Amino acid sequence: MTDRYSFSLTTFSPSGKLGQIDYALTAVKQGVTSLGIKATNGVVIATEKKSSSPLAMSETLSKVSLLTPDIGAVYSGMGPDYRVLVDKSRKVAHTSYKRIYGEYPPTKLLVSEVAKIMQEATQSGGVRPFGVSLLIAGHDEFNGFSLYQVDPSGSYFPWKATAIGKGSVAAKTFLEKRWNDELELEDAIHIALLTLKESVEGEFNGDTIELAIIGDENPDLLGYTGIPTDKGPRFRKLTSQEINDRLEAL
Amino acid sequence: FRNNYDGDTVTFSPTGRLFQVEYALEAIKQGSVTVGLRSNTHAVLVALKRNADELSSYQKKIIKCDEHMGLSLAGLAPDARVLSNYLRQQCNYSSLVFNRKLAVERAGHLLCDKAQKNTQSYGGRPYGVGLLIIGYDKSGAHLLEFQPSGNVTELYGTAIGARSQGAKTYLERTLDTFIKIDGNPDELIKAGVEAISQSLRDESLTVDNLSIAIVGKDTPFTIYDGEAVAKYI
Amino acid sequence: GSRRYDSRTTIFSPEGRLYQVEYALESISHAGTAIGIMASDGIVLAAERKVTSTLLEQDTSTEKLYKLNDKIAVAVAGLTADAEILINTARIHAQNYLKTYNEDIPVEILVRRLSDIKQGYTQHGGLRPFGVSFIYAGYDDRYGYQLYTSNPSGNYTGWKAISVGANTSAAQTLLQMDYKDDMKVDDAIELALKTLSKTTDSSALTYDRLEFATIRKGANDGEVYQKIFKPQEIKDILVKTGIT
Amino acid sequence: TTTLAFRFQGGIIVAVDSRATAGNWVASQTVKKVIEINPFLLGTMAGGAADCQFWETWLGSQCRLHELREKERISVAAASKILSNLVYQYKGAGLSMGTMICGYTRKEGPTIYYVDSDGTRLKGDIFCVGSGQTFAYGVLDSNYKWDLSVEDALYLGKRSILAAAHRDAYSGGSVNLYHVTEDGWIYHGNHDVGELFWKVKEEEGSFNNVIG
Amino acid sequence: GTGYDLSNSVFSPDGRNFQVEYAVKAVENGTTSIGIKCNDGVVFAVEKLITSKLLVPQKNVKIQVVDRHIGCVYSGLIPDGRHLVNRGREEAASFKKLYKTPIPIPAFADRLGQYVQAHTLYNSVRPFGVSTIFGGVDKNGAHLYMLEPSGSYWGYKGAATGKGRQSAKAELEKLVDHHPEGLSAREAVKQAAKIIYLAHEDNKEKDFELEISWCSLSETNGLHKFVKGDLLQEAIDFAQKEIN
Amino acid sequence: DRGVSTFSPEGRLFQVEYSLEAIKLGSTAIGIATKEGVVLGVEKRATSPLLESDSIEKIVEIDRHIGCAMSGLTADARSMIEHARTAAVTHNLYYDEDINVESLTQSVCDLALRFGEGASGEERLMSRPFGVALLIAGHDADDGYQLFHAEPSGTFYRYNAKAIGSGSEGAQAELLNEWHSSLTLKEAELLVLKILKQVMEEKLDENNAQLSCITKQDGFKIYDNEKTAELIKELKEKEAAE
Amino acid sequence: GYDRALSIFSPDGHIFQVEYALEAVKRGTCAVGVKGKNCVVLGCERRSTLKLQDTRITPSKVSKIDSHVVLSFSGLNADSRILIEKARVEAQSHRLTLEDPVTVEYLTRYVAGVQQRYTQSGGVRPFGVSTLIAGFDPRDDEPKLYQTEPSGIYSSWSAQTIGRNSKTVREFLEKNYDRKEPPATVEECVKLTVRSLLEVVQTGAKNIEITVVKPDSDIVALSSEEINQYVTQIEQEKQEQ
Amino acid sequence: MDIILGIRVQDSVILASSKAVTRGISVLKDSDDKTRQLSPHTLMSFAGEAGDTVQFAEYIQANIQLYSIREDYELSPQAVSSFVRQELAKSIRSRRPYQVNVLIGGYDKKKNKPELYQIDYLGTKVELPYGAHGYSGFYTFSLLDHHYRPDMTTEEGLDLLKLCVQELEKRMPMDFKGVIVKIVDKDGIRQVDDFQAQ
């Protein structure tokens, strides 16, 4: 027994490439498309719920996840990997931040934490890189709204808007055309819904699409009242109904 | 074939063999011959000590494990030291904790089990030595044959080493005869020297070349070398 | 066993070379070029952002210039993520030194420590080396302005002007051609931009594709100041030097 | 116990008593409180019998290893520091020992080091260690001269321990003498206090109190 | 490609684990041994090839007891079998110590099962080279089991493994059909002796020694005991007779 | 690749055999035991005239009654000598007596097979066998003067005379004829000096060769250059004598 | 966790990793050391693959282990640091317990042991470094010069060189160094050192650094000029013929 | 306890330390130097528990010398003192703390100013014109509080100590067998062999 794999599974080839990271990226390329658009007063992340059987209940499978009450994530690539990454991301937000400073981490730092976790799976002994690319959207008092991308290598970058997965090249191009630094959140949600339509083959509605936003504080989603400073989470997942309503104005 | 499945002991060949173990067994055959036989009152070990040059000593092949137990080796000397030392402790433990002399049958079980571990785990290597254990316990004289495979067998007599087959057939023939040599050590020893010589070929057992050990009813396991074995050549 | 799948990242080639280090350097050679120039009154760090898009948020971005201390900064060439790991441990080492001696860490001590960490992944552990090369630009009261460079092997050296990343050979010749010991920060700022401008594999050298930083001792003060140029600031200094 | 060692012109004198006790019980009158670390190193013992004997015998083993390793005789300073550093590792555990490491090296010449279980290590010319140290000091201090004869120094040493054996209930038995010159130590006998006292009394006229 | 059979935990393209399959070969190459479940106990018996007249008869015992109510017999690499029993013995001691009640057969079966299955999970270990037949009487009846190198096992009416597993199984099946009411401990002991004599034909070249053991609620009080003397000879004859 | 503690089809341990090859490439070392003491001689074999030959230490002291000579990858011998010295000194601390020469040798050989990447038997942390053979010579009250050959195989033989290193097969043959149970210490010295001269590529002088002995009276002593020089002269003379 | 045997014997009896470690040294810049009658001098060459360095801060090739001992080397730079640090720590530890600074042979024996150990320990590769350690034992005036190599072997030399073209410069020293009359001066010792380096450095006033070590912790490195002066006087010895 | 005094004058720091080493009923030595030179311009005096005292001093000495050789530079007095404080601060919360009090006097070649640091075994550090450890402070702090001036010459400083030492020899219960005085300034550390009657 005992993990005797204490050496790297990712190494440099004569050309300077790190095969496993490249291959991980290839896995991401095969993944369903996902994207994110930053508005002046909010951010939107969305993706397609590619149900693997009409018997499966697509709700019981969220591709879009809340990390902190003001930070959400979505991905493209290997779903299982993403799941454990969200578990770890939610926990590191506490262990390495809330438990020290008593406040949730700002989007850049949590992204940095996630990125670290991924970088390690690129050098630690006996493991393979994570086969996913994440898009994290959030808001913090001193940095406002932000949108980041974290790749299997552990590298991350901030975006105004971008797409990853299957038709990322096409979607990125479509976004460059419609984006501007004056978009309101609803405008971005619309632009988002349009971009996603080009990537969806079949049914395109509030049950096949999963979309969430980082916007205003939802005091109605706090769970309690009596503390003025606590105004509610900025992260909200749109309901099937809320999506359809915006689709009729597509 | 074989070349792909003999890299380490943790690999089974397509036919169910463990080559690393088999190669270990091969170090035994290349080892000098030694013989074991017992009556109902004694057990004897006769071993042919091998020498490098004519300027070198004839490497000892018999090790005492306790007042009532001992063995002879054929193969990697160091490995026999390791195994005999282990057996010395097992014997020692039995006395100190239970004030009981270790049964020769139990000694075998302990040896088998220790060897087995080095054949199922990565990184290790099988022991490359054969052992012949004799002893007198609460159930009489005993003789055991230990193979690195982990297989230990109780016999009336036997031999391991190069050309060991000679002595072995001889004992399988002399069986009914020596098994009755009770109350007479000199006769069992002679019967052993006769069995061992059935495997000679190169030379003839000399004085600083022969080594004999005996244990039984009223005989604490003792080793005889040189002048002491002169009267048997 | 596992031995079958072990690359043995820490062995010598028959020529006495370290495979992984050599291949990591090969990786570094395709990274955006980073330049460091040391003048009499300061140091300049300029780097070219590898890959960019219209949608890339350049304001909130940083992939090449990182602040280690208040008196030391580095320019990165290679795996950004690998760099961040090393950058963080470097930042901690600077603080242990401060908490221990109540004095800011001398530049070389910090550089040597970081280089030793790299050297380690070279001699034991069976892990791949870090695909990173750093240009360190710092200042201390013992050697004043200093410029250093370290790579995957764990070796480090000091320079008056140097480059890491892609087209270093070209950049070094251009630098070794117009550098002068009595230069001035503003001169270096210009030399740096020109050099990058001639080695870039891109069409033009625009501001959105750059990161700039200077460590000067603002005369009107007496202390050392690090300045990581903002998009607008890079766009300006770009027009002025005549690259528009 | 009473032990002394002092540096003078002719080298070093080392004298010890030989009594061992467990309370008021005199366990031994014939114990060796001087271990010959080697042909040129002596160690005095005071405190717990076991602690001294064991650790100083161990010290000897360490010195021998130094010589096999460095192809050179260990220095009095280095040898004493081995013991001192060992004893310090055990600080607080209860080891009880007052020791003197005396030797002669070409590099240091006559040298004496005081080492105790508190971790104290001191270099000096005169030291008295043990329950009877003060008694020895009284005699030794008032008759010491750097210019004593190897004969006189030996006697003062012997006489100093005698004094201690007499007044200290926990010291006694016999006196063991040693003289240290670069050619090593020279054993100078075991003088039973039982006979040494009367001899010294008569020949010296001291101990005038006691009736003889 | 190929090579899927060189490392223990590797899945071949058709979803198999060749090393375990090769372990099986080692088992099939071994002596034949069986187990017969009777109406209130179980009987174990095995073939003991007599290599030479030198083997002290009746001494090199193979059947092993676990605790005081379990019997175990195996075919294949004997040393591996001992290893597996040593484990089972600990497994049982542990269970008794915490729950007081000696370990139920099913419970014991899984203990052996999980441990064996464990050796098919890593490439740093080799699978067991033995198929083991074991059983006993517990709180609710008698139970017979057989465990493969894969870690697979099931409850059996009768079971056999080794060289003559086919003759044995053939014979066992007859018994199952001709005795829907259940064989008796006394009967099973004989039936067992015969099945070994029959199944010995696939090795008729070498002479052998018979070994039987049983655990019957009425015949042994639910404790495992070895069949010796008269009862043994009586079964040896019942076989020697029906072999002609 | 293949395990460092793997067996060859012939029943040999690859690493130990290859180990022996390295030792054949080593400098010659010879030892002769006589009822008057054991002599140990070695070929310095400097690799350049600028190398100060007397800094070549291939003959070392284990204890006052035990000396040892090495041949092969000599750097591998440092930890062995250390272990041996400690073993000897430790034995003396525990028992207040000299350690037997055989016992000391058995102790050193116990390190031999302690190599591998995870051998199930204890904690043998050593990536490879030693690449050096040793000749341990000494004396003890029970078996007088003794000479042992300790190899990386863990086995150790006792010899009346033995040669290891580049000129071993040749030198051993020589020793076969020249050695007899009544040799004097002086005869052994000259004999060792003679055989070294035949196998050495260089003309043997008191600078590229070194002698030493171990006698019950004075223990292990390494002959200084002047002492050996004369023995060399005495040898040239007796040879030219016939 | 990682303990793979990287340095192992091959059929012909060689440890290829240790052998390849030497190839690393062959590639390193040259280094030499010649002992005078009252001093030891250490010369080392400076590469030129890239020139625009800051000599003030760039790590020098000759390092002080203690105030009376120096160590130069040829091979992997990163590796040398590890050895230098351990050497420096051991130097202090020795002063702390023996109450006397280390002897050059002792400090050498130590560095060699660290190197040897890395040739037969799992999970590590040998040091691709060879060293020259020189100085004066405490209270002694007889100069000391030793050399170590990846294998862990060490010994003393009257003069020695390691690194690229060390073959060439050794020849020079072998037919230019008389043990009968060693450079009786610090000056003529430094000269014999530069001469040997010029046999390979090919005109490099700024490509040759020298350090002089005298008894009682008297250590100093020469400046470009001082050295450049020796080069000058040497080139004339040639032309004046 | 032992006498450990220190006084920072105009261009130097003077350290006076008692010469006695007493164990129980006997004064074992009367020429003990309770000081260790950490670097050419930094001196440290110490007093406290029997073994911990020197062991600690030498340990710190070793580390500073190692730093000096690694960096070929001399850490400022302020830096060396900060290192010592942290060492003691770690020690206080360990299994068996070093029970040692120290005075660190050094001349800062970069600032060209003498500095005197007082640090107790708890890791309590403070920079002072003059300091003392143990019972001495009880009679020397008010003395110096009276006769001390920042511009005093090294000579006036030695007179000042002599005054302290006399007060200590009049009112202190113990015979500390005089003191050993050392001067730390721009030229290093030197000992005043003549204080037995200056």
Short mmCIF file of C-alpha atoms in Angstrom, two decimals, chain A residues 186 190 193 205-206 239-250:
data_model
loop_
_atom_site.label_atom_id
_atom_site.label_comp_id
_atom_site.label_asym_id
_atom_site.label_seq_id
_atom_site.Cartn_x
_atom_site.Cartn_y
_atom_site.Cartn_z
CA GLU A 186 -29.70 43.51 -17.30
CA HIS A 190 -29.23 39.81 -22.24
CA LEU A 193 -28.31 34.88 -23.13
CA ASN A 205 -34.85 27.78 -22.09
CA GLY A 206 -34.78 28.35 -18.34
CA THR A 239 -34.82 30.88 -11.48
CA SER A 240 -36.05 28.95 -14.50
CA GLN A 241 -38.94 31.43 -14.65
CA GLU A 242 -36.72 34.52 -14.43
CA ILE A 243 -34.72 33.22 -17.36
CA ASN A 244 -37.68 32.53 -19.64
CA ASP A 245 -39.03 36.03 -19.07
CA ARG A 246 -35.77 37.42 -20.43
CA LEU A 247 -35.85 34.97 -23.33
CA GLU A 248 -39.09 36.43 -24.72
CA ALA A 249 -37.21 39.73 -25.06
CA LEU A 250 -34.42 37.84 -26.84
#
